[PDB]
Every structure is written in C-alpha cells, then in structure tokens.
Design an enzyme around this catalytic site. Structure first.
Site, short mmCIF file in Angstrom:
data_model
loop_
_atom_site.label_atom_id
_atom_site.label_comp_id
_atom_site.label_asym_id
_atom_site.label_seq_id
_atom_site.Cartn_x
_atom_site.Cartn_y
_atom_site.Cartn_z
N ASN A 168 -3.94 3.64 0.91
CA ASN A 168 -3.70 3.25 2.27
C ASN A 168 -4.14 1.82 2.56
O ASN A 168 -3.62 1.22 3.51
CB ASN A 168 -4.42 4.16 3.26
CG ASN A 168 -3.87 5.58 3.25
OD1 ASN A 168 -2.99 5.91 2.46
ND2 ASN A 168 -4.43 6.41 4.11
N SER A 225 -0.90 2.60 11.68
CA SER A 225 -1.14 3.86 12.37
C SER A 225 -1.91 3.59 13.64
O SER A 225 -2.87 2.79 13.64
CB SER A 225 -1.86 4.91 11.54
OG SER A 225 -2.10 6.11 12.25
#
Ligand SMILES: CC(=O)Cc1cc[n+]([C@@H]2O[C@H](COP(=O)([O-])OP(=O)(O)OC[C@H]3O[C@@H](n4cnc5c(N)ncnc54)[C@H](O)[C@@H]3O)[C@@H](O)[C@H]2O)cc1C(N)=O
Ligand SMILES: CC(=O)Cc1cc[n+]([C@@H]2O[C@H](COP(=O)([O-])OP(=O)(O)OC[C@H]3O[C@@H](n4cnc5c(N)ncnc54)[C@H](O)[C@@H]3O)[C@@H](O)[C@H]2O)cc1C(N)=O
Lengths: 254, 254
Positions: B107, B138
């Site tokens: 990530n 996000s």
C-alpha cells in the site's frame, strides 16, 4: 500523571531529542528507566545515571527492524524483571530519503511492530493491565517537508496509527498520544539526503528558518507525558507545547 | 485533459475499482492501455478489449513488492515500445491488518517504488518529458478506520506522498493527484481482518452504512483524471467527486 516510581521503556532514548528528554525524565524519580537503542552510547548512560542515582537505568541493544517475535522475546525479559511497565516511548527515526525501504521500516513498520509486541503484555482482553504509548512522530506527518517525501509520509503514517490506537483504548486498555516536534537542532537535520536529490541543500535551507533546541523540545516532551491525554496530538514547535485538532474530512461511522 | 490517443499505465487495473475505472477509460479512445497486475484475468481482459477495439490493450504481470530495479526493468521495455507514457495510475492495495509488513509493502512502499522507478524515464532533470501520476489512496488516509489502523496509516502515508509529489512538479515535470474513494462495494471490504482482532465484525459494521458502487466510483475516477489538477486531493464518496483542502497545521517554509 505522576512519574514518581514509574517504569518507563524508551526506544531510541540516546538520540538528540531522546537524550534531552531522558535527562528531564530521570529527574522525575522513575523507579526503572529502560533504554532500548540500536547503538550503545556509554557516555550518555553514565551521564544519565549521574543525574539521579535513585533511578535504576538499564540499557538493552534493540533494533526496531527486527520481527515482532524478536521484540516480544526482549519485552518478556524486561517484564520478567520489572513486572509492570507503565509507559512505552517509541522514538526511533532516520532521515535519509535515499534509503526508501529503510526509512519506512524504521519510522513506520518498526513503531507498529514494537506496539504490536507490547500489546501481548498489556492487552486488557488478555488480562493485562493496559498501558500508555507515547509515539515520537513529527510535524511533517501533518504537512510534509516535500523534498523528503518518504520521510514525511512515514511520519504521516505514525500520526494516523497513533490516532487509531487512542481510539482503541476502551478495547485494549492502552492509551496513546503523539509527540510531534517541529525542527529541532540535532544531528538528524544537520545534513541529509532528499528524494532523488530534488533538493541537495535541503538541510541548509531548513535551518535558515527558526528552530528550537533539543532542551526546549525535551522539556515540553515531559510536560506532555505528565499531561497524559489519550488521543492528544502534541505539537512541540519553537519552544511551545500545543495540542492540535485533527480535521474530520471523513467518518467511517464505526 | 483529453484522453484520446493517450498512453496509460494502470497498476492494479483488474481489481474491483480498477476494472470499473478501466471500462470507462477504454471508452475514451486511448492509444495504448497497459495493465500491470499481479495475476492475469483473461475474462476481464477480453471484456475490456470488447468495449473498444481501437484501444491497444496489453497486460504484464507485475507485483509492486519487487525492488525498484525490477520495476525499472519492466518500465524500460514499456517506454521503449510505446515511446511515451502520459499517465501512470498506482492502484494496488490490500486490506488485512493481520499482514502488517505486507500491508505496508504493497500500500505504501510499492507505490513509492513504482513512482521512483518511472521518474527515471520522466524526470525533466534527465531530459524526460514529465508525466502525470494518479494515486489511489483512500479516505482512510484522511481519517482512519481505527479498527484497521495499519491499513489506514499506510493510506495516510500515500496521501502525504502524493501531496509532496505535486509540490515537486516544477523540478521533476511530474504532476500528481490522489484519488480517495469512500467505502466502495468490492471484494476488498466484504470480509477483512482487523488489527489484533479488536473488531472481528468490522466488515459487517462498515457495510451497514451508506456505500457507493464501483461503477459510481469508476465514473468519478475518470472525471478526476480528465480534470487533471496537479495536487488535487479528490474524494470519491457516495457517488460524488469532491476536492478537499488539506489543513495547514505546520509549514516548513521551504
Ligand atoms: C525533521 C523532523 O521530523 C522534525 C522533528 C520531529 C521529529 N523528529 C524525530 O524525532 C525522533 C528522534 O530524532 P532526533 O532528532 O533525536 O535524531 P537522532 O538521529 O539524533 O536520533 C535517532 C534516534 O533513533 C534511533 N534509531 C535509529 N534507527 C534505529 C533502529 N533501527 N532501531 C532503534 N533505534 C533507532 C537512534 O539510535 C537514535 O537514538 C525521530 O523519530 C525523528 O524522526 C526529529 C525532528 C528534528 N530533529 O527536528
Ligand atoms: C477500504 C477503503 O480504503 C475505502 C476505498 C478506498 C480506497 N481503496 C483502495 O482502492 C484500491 C483498489 O481496491 P479494490 O477495492 O478494487 O480491491 P481489490 O481487492 O478488488 O483490488 C486490489 C487491486 O490491487 C491489486 N494488487 C494487490 N496486491 C498487489 C501486488 N502485490 N502487486 C500488484 N497489484 C496488487 C490486485 O491485484 C487488484 O488489482 C486499493 O488501493 C484500495 O486500498 C478501496 C476502497 C474500497 N474498496 O472501498
């Protein structure tokens, strides 16, 4: 919170901010002060022991890039001796955006892994007593130094991770708060590598703006510890201590 | 920006959000659409090729956890064939806070490394043409889901890292913006592990609140790409597209 007779573990206590924080801490009449650091520094140990002979000061070599299982092993040894630990300070940090993987492993992963390991001893779900985690993050976790984007991103991570830990306190028993120094005169910032050398003079330009000393920093660090506010996001910048409010941009509802 | 006859690399194009984004993208009459993903999906590939036969679609197996030197190797081949690449989309992501190191590696570290690798071909300091990076971060990078503190901190890192990229554009030639979806119905969120299982029903609780579809998300993603705003922080939540303002808590002055 009153530090008298407390047992404290400080990861990376012998660095520039660490050492000046440590000098103030051992003034408070801790019972036990456990230093975990990668590199021995024999001079600083003797100095710290000088300041307050009442405190038991112990040193153990610890690299935060070891696997969680290794952290747990070391922490078991320490809980075995001390029985209880009241406070863990996570302070390890490098600044070198030529070492991408190593920055993230130390600044972010290792802090998560030490936290994860100690929860085994503290988790109230397992019968533990709970505990207190003080994380040294950085104002660059708020707003990057964009010439070192990797360093700053790794610190944005641990500010977030600390916010979340603080919200897990009713389940885990472990409260948490972050300590975010502004630019502080230590060896960390004297010279350092920018990412893909976008700014070879980043250290020179940084220190042409107002800074604080590590002694100012260290003094305000201990005050924030004594404030003991779960979920605080402490800014320690230009000699002051200030709690910031995190912006609610989004809410998960859970 | 007009996507007609553009060459696009999309890392992790075949996931839930990826695939619905990709269906919209190939409607725009790209010249070349290069999919890099960890495993081939010939179903999705055949679908995508069906939608717009004008687009040349190619697939290469790519894991973002390889070392930068492997990324550069793969990219070098792609640039040589295509000659120019206009846009890179980094979209790889896992959600599983039992896999601490793996979450961070995919990530956060992997996104940094892909970015670092492609800068070799784009950096204007090296004679490159500059380029456009779209990062899937996000909304949990703004405000954590605190039951998955490691996932959320990893996304806080890439939001920070994307902001810094955008501020380096006058030096590198490479602009960048983040795409931050709210909760989006995909296989990522249907069931997932929380950290130390503090909340074994996190998925169930999350999806009891309003969500958006991956088609809604996908549509708004291509609009943000067409907006082409360097430094935008795009929120793609509940079927809307909104730019947020990052709070200035601290300024480095450089
Ligand atoms: C630039 C910036 O972030 C602003 C400000 C905030 C945060 N920080 C952070 O404060 C903390 C201390 O930094 P400092 O200025 O004292 O730097 P320093 O380099 O003097 O201290 C580094 C400390 O981290 C430890 N350490 C490094 N790698 C380790 C590893 N693998 N395992 C265990 N310990 C390790 C060292 O052994 C040492 O004790 C760091 O986390 C750093 O990132 C520094 C400042 C500053 N010096 O201005
Ligand atoms: C949960 C959350 O943060 C809200 C929201 C925002 C951002 N995200 C992010 O969106 C992106 C896509 O998520 P998704 O929901 O489509 O999930 P998914 O599981 O369908 O897709 C994951 C994508 O990443 C790729 N991938 C995983 N590991 C890889 C590796 N090692 N190398 C190369 N590619 C790899 C997969 O192959 C796939 O293309 C991820 O970055 C994810 O974290 C998802 C949501 C959502 N689904 O609600």
């Amino acid at each position: 919170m009153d530090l008298t007779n407390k047992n404290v573990i400080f990861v990376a206590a012998l660095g520039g901010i660490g050492l000046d924080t440590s000098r103030e801490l051992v003034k408070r009449n801790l019972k036990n002060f456990v230093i975990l650091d990668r590199v021995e520094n024999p001079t600083a140990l003797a100095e710290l022991k000088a300041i307050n002979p009442k405190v038991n000061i112990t040193f153990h070599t610890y690299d935060v890039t070891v696997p969680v299982a290794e952290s747990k092993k070391l922490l078991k040894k320490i809980f075995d001796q001390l029985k209880t630990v009241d406070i863990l300070i996570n302070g390890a940090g490098i600044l070198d955006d030529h070492q991408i993987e190593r920055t993230i492993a130390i600044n972010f992963t290792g802090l998560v892994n030490t936290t994860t390991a100690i929860l085994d001893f503290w988790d109230k779900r397992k019968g533990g007593p709970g505990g207190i985690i003080a994380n040294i993050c950085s104002v660059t976790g708020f707003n990057a130094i964009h010439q070192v984007p990797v360093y700053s991103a790794s610190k944005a991570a641990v500010v977030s991770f600390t916010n979340s830990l603080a919200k897990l306190a009713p389940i885990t028993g472990v409260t948490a708060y972050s300590i975010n120094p502004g630019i502080t005169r230590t060896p960390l910032v004297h010279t350092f590598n920018s990412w893909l050398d976008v700014e070879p003079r980043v250290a020179e330009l940084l220190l042409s703006h107002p800074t604080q000393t590590s002694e100012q920093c260290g003094q305000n660090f201990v005050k924030a510890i004594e404030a003991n506010k779960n979920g605080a996001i402490w800014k320690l910048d230009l000699g002051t201590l200030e709690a910031i409010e995190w912006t609610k941009h989004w809410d998960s509802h859970i």
